[PDB]
Ligand binder design. Structure first.
Ligand SMILES: [Ca+2]
Ligand SMILES: [Ca+2]
Ligand SMILES: [Ca+2]
Ligand SMILES: [Ca+2]
Ligand SMILES: [Ca+2]
Ligand SMILES: [Ca+2]
Lengths: 209, 209
């Protein structure tokens, strides 16, 4: 059966994963080995096996974003020097932890809007990515919010962002090019549908005629 | 051996966990079943098994803080109505996600300090707990910070908090009873050693003498 291990595990190492046994255990003395990337190939020694007991072990914390899936092979050789089984495929799946903050595609997004634009007009889009597992978890489910607006004139809520799409829209009337030519918005992207880890970037909006 | 499953999984359900096989599937057609709390007993239907193929599945997102360990038994009955195998124990371990914010033991912590206390004197202790897995993960490793001090006089750094202990101390001199009687500190607790999920509470300090 497939084997699971969570990434970023703490505590004492090594940790037991599964004990491998051969049926020819009582017929003859059996020695156990593992090969593959993560065993004898780079990264070397991530997984080990006790040669006499057959206990498969992980020796360090794992990282899903480095390697999410390990394919290894177990070997069973008797004291006479013959393989008593065919090499057996071992698949080790690395399950995700929410350990990556979202990341905006740019540090400073540029947009523009006409000062006459009706409330509810789309202006610009911001976007972030999240390196965590977006297939199985919510650790990469991003929600967009606006943290601050500068200047806060004529008031502090001139714009709003669609929490799913990252589209920034004119929320209210009051845009005035002659008084406040540009706005610096600090936008936020947070995983766990807005409840988790977060990052910030800037959105600079120029006001046009 | 488990049979590990992460909590709060998204996507389509049910999801394959493992395929149960009997040897004596060649002689006779075998029907597979599972019993126990989580199968036929409350909570009913969390885990199911295909009767003909023997694929054990989970039907819903799990919650480690509700149930962290399931004990099931798989049964193998032939078409003639006789059990061909003894009931086999199946342990199901629920692995942790960081889905719980740290929570302070109180909403408002109360302490006091004499105005003549030398800088570096212990004043009080704030405490937070985290419901996530503190044995295997960092999802419950709490770090304390002071977000804000009120009032910011004589300056904004009158107090400091030990990030591990939650012990608040006098950082600087200037602690006049007469001109400022009460300090309300906004304290924060963040998991993943300060880098994860967070909530805030209040610490009210009354200056004595
Ligand atoms: Ca990682
Ligand atoms: Ca991750
Ligand atoms: Ca994330
Ligand atoms: Ca939970
Ligand atoms: Ca949890
Ligand atoms: Ca937590």
């Amino acid at each position: 059966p497939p084997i699971s291990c969570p990434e970023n595990e703490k505590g004492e190492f090594p940790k037991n994963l599964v004990q491998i046994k051969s049926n020819r255990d009582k017929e003859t003395k059996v020695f156990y080995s593992i090969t593959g990337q993560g065993a004898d190939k780079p990264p070397v020694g991530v997984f080990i096996i006790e040669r006499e007991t057959g206990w498969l072990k992980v020796t360090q914390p794992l990282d899903r974003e480095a390697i999410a899936k390990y394919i290894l092979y177990s070997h069973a050789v008797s004291s006479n020097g013959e393989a008593v089984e065919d090499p057996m495929e071992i698949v080790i799946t690395v399950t995700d932890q929410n350990d990556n903050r979202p990341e905006f595609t740019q540090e400073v997004f540029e947009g523009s809007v006409a000062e006459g634009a009706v409330p509810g007009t789309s202006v610009m889009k911001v976007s972030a990515t999240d390196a965590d597992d977006d297939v199985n978890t919510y650790n990469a489910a991003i929600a967009y919010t606006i943290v601050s607006q500068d200047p806060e004139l004529p008031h502090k809520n001139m714009f709003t962002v669609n929490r799913d799409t990252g589209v920034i829209s004119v929320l209210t009337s009051g845009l005035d090019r002659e008084s406040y030519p540009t706005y610096t918005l600090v936008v936020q992207a947070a995983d766990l549908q807005g409840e988790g880890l977060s990052t910030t970037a800037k959105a600079v909006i120029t006001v046009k005629d």
